[PDB]
Nucleic acid binder design. Sequence first.
RNA 1: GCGAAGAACCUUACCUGGUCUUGACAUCCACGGAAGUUUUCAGAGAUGAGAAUGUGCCUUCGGGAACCGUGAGACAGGUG
RNA 2: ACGACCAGGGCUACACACGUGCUACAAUGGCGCAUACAAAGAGAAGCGACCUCGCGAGAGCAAGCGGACCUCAUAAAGUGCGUCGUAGUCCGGAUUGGAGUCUGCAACUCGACUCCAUGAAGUCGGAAUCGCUAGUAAUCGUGGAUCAGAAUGCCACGGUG
Lengths: 151, 278, 114, 96, 79, 206
Amino acid sequence: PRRRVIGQRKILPDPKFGSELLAKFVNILMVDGKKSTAESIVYSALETLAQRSGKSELEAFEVALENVRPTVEVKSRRVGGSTYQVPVEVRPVRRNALAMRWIVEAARKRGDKSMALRLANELSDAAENKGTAVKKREDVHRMAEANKAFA
Amino acid sequence: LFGEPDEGIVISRFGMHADVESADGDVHRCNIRRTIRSLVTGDRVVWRPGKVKGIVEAVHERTSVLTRPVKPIAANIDQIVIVSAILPELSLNIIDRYLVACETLQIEPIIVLNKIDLLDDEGMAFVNEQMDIYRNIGYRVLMVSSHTQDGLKPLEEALTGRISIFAGQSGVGKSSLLNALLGLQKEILTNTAARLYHFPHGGDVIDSPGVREFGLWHLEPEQITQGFVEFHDYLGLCKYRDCKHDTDPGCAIREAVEEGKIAETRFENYHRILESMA
Amino acid sequence: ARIAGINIPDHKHAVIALTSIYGVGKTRSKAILAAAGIAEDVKISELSEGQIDTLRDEVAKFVVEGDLRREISMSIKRLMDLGCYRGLRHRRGLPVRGQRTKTNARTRKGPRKP
Amino acid sequence: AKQSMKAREVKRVALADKYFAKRAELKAIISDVNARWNAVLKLQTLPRDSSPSRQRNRCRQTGRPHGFLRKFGLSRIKVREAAMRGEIPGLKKASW
Amino acid sequence: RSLKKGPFIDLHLLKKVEKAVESGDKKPLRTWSRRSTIFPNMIGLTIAVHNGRQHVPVFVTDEMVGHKLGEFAPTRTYR
Amino acid sequence: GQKVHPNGIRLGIVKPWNSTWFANTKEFADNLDSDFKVRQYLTKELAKASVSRIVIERPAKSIRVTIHTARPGIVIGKKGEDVEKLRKVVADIAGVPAQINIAEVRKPELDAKLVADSITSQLERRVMFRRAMKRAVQNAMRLGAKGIKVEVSGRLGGAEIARTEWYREGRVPLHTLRADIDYNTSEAHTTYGVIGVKVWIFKGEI
RNA sequence: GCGAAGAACCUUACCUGGUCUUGACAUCCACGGAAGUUUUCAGAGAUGAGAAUGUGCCUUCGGGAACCGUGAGACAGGUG
RNA sequence: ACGACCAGGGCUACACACGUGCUACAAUGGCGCAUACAAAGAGAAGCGACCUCGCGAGAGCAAGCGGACCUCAUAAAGUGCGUCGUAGUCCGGAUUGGAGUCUGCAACUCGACUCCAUGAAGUCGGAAUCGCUAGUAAUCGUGGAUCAGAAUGCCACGGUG
């Protein structure tokens, strides 16, 4: 994409929210290539998050994703093989994409029954800005605005 | 050219020719035909006179046990003498490089420490200790002086019935020992067809000064490894594939070094050699 | 009960906790356990042991534990004693329920070797 | 291939009228409980060679018993090798 | 184990097992045939089936019986 | 040759069917067998009368081999024998009785085929492939084509190679594919190596 | 997981053993079997050995076509 | 003769390494149950209902219908509940046992099926490849092809993504 750069594809959302945020995100887990059954165990978590948010399942996500999402980043493409290190604004397609992924990437293969829990336990934590995913918002921005010496 | 087929061993590389000492022992400076090419000094050859000039039209260079770039010099070298002194700087990798090679080649090193006499009580000892690393590793050390040409009999006897060779660096008195051995100086040096000599107690020796100030030759990775058999044993030590003899978790070879189960030098040398081919 | 697939195949989905609890394999270990009807979605130790131990006994009339393992050993042996191909392989240390000897013959030829 | 991996197969049929009898595709209509009724499940003083498993699928063009394909009488070589040009009443590969 | 509903025998060979009856358990017979199955009726000798070269005698130790002559007998050779 | 040629994809797509008989699957192979058993035969039978294209039909499953020949006249032969024997064979080797139908080519120089073979049967005489080729490829560009290419492989002059040398002449494509590309090959299989002759004739494009 | 869309043997070639050698195949010719048939036995089978049957047109039921091999070359053979 | 025939063996051996795969590991995961939407493939030696049974294997028996005529043959992921609770587990399945069943002349070597019994490693993969950016990754079924007998594969097959 050296000629014309890009985000994601064939995504599928919610028949109850229609939220893309939730769509690109529900999706992420797939590499099961079917969120005809993916989505379910995250809702138990987002439900426990729904409560934990004081909102619904939709907006259980929302809160935790807005914590999670980066507002800046540092970007690489390697111009000349060069070590890019200058602070940049994380593009939305990343904001979202990476963020959504980050939450999901923080409740993985584990040690006990039900992801429902596993997710639940990730979810509110990301709600509280002390999730893993939100800490990637709060680590990428730390590298930003403190290095600019190299090209 | 043609002549009468006769056997000989190539006594010398006569530059342009090769000089062949016949089966009888008669040396004939011979031509070497466009037709033949697998010739080296030491080859048993069919050489023919003319109808001296000879011509060579058959050779006999037996199997590899040493090269430069990667091209056998001779054969029946059952022992490689890695002969050293410090000129003009030196390193443990350099002797080891030769050792790795001796080990690869399956030609016996007899590690000869020249200038033993030169080396003070401390120095001789230090050097002996170093010589010992290799020795411990399996490569016997013979203390000689380059100059004094000491331990000459133990060396000679090691030479008996076999062919030996002089390796090292910038006329590290290798040249000196060679002179003793011969009992005639045929080389000094200080800071693949060449010439061969025959031993009286039995066996032979091959020499060239050119070899002696050093550069080094092309090789492959496995050979370096062959240079160190203790690594095989370490390869088995972690995993059914031990990383790669070098660091990475579960590199036994590396561990064995960390332990000191292997000497460090072997690993180090493994690298100087490894890098050079690459 | 333990049901000669020696351990209380409870708690779990719980007959199936005797597939591999010897003797009573999968099948017998079910048919034993439902010879007192104890849960198999959940436990089998939640009920009166004597109704299950009669089963332990009932199944002490099935091929079980030591003897069956022994059977297994014996039978295996049988092969060899004649010499066979089942025999042969077993006597070759080679799999008698298979795995390539050029390649990763490893459960039966240790879980990996050069 | 050779004459022979093909050539092999012609020679097999003869012995039966000089020597034997006839039974060709009728020997085992007995041998189950079709309903093992042993009747032709019991002779072998007489030749061993031949069974449909001893049969293999000789390429016609080479005799190639294998490589063979159930739709051409050939082995695949000659299949493709015939297949592309046509002289056939249709074929296609146009993104397929 | 697992059964091919039908096992087998062969007549020239089976005839020979009877030959090793009226010629007893003398010394091993040679057929190349391994299609025929091991039995205690194959006790009558110990019997040698071709396994390339090798006509290997099969033991009529009849805990090997659901086992043709090639089961007991060699086939391949290997390390 | 080397490649999955231009004809690295072309099979029946926009290609008139030489068998064209709607036989059907069950005997289809066999229709082809017969087809190409008369083709096998046919090309042997009119190997001098100059069949330029055998087409086969089995109208109502009654083989009907259609010949385009450089000269029908020799194909019909004197007093219809040459077509007769085809009736015999074709009826009896296509099974589906012979109809044997003779037509006269568009131009043999528009035949990849003709040209190649010609050039082979030229070559064979002790003429050069250059001469032989030349003359054909020339008089194919003359009008007997408006393109014509040869694009060979195997032992060229008897060298230790098999990579493209060719004799394109005119306006000939090899990659704008809905091209009348009469393509064939011949060869002088050589008693030196192997010479592949591969001769196309561009008859235009479609 | 390279050419089998199949390597049990077979296939099969290749081991390995066993066969054959105008060759296993071929082709004519003779020749016999017409053609071609009916059936037994034995050998690992290769094949080894038995008995049976029918030959239509022309016609050494050989031939010719039968249709095969042999046998023998001519001729035949090769994924040798 | 390498021609060439056969028998029977040989691949596929085994310290093995390796590729190139396959597979676990699980968590909704394994596990029980409940429970819809696929498509695409295949038929007349045929495909093959019923039927019948067999868990099945198998086995016994068998219509329709040359295929929008019947039938091979059917999606499953989907979907509705429990369970268990990444436990070498119901994971996970090696390993084996023990026997059914199958195909092929016979599989006994070097052929294929159920049950039963047995149930490693594996817990996510060190070092270390590639792929891939959508219907890809990736995933559910599904299928063909041809092999006498065998589709980790190919060849196919549509769902979901």
